[PDB]
Amino acid sequence: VPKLPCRVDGACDATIIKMMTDLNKKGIKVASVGQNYLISIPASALFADQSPRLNWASYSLLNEIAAFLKQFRKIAITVTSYSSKYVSVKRERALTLARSRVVSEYLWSQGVDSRIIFTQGLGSDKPITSYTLGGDRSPNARVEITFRRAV
């Protein structure tokens, strides 16, 4: 007992509840059904107007999300990016792929202990809302990070 570990290291239930509550008040949607977890981020809080260039201040938010992801134990993470319709199908397929590549790289640079990270960009193919009047301000231009907690 004094030399076996007593819990998974660096993890606490109060810290999980605290950070989930803070993220939901800030505006990033965190949801859990069963043991699957979803984090949904609006694209306006991360990128410039449809360019794959991060602002300098959004790295604090990515750091906060990485500190959340270190609390669990997991095997695979999927990052998928979706955008809104601008010019053709190809331009936003390329845009969403670039956005997901950059975000998953910074998450891999920080110490998330996953075995696989998959990245894909779906363009503007799967909308979650019929109100399509905004540009990048629209609620259906987003990045979603999904995973399953393992044991």
């Binding site: 030399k3 076996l4 570990p5 007593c6 819990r7 998974v8 290291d9 993890a11 606490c12 239930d13 109060a14 509840i17 605290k18 043991q35 134990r73 907690r149 044991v151």
Partner: protein
């Protein structure tokens, strides 16, 4: 001490996974059996990666492992 803090407290030990269950439906971070997936990387003792310590008692201080290797490292010096 406090495993399910900011949850409802301990419900029970799930021995199939080796984990505690809190009073909301969340798995805890605390272990409750020894056959749980703990991520062990650092182990003590000597004659690891051999058979272990051959249990004869020696007049001198040499420590010999079960496959004939001699641990000079756990052996006392003169």
């Amino acid at each position: 001490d406090g495993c399910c803090s900011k949850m409802g407290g301990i419900n029970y030990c799930d021995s199939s996974a080796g984990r505690l269950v809190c009073n909301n439906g969340f798995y805890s971070t605390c272990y409750c059996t020894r056959h749980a997936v703990m991520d062990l990387q650092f182990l003590m003792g000597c004659c690891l990666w051999h058979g272990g310590v051959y249990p004869q008692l020696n007049s001198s201080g040499l420590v010999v492992c079960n496959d004939g290797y001699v641990s000079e490292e756990c052996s006392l010096q003169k």
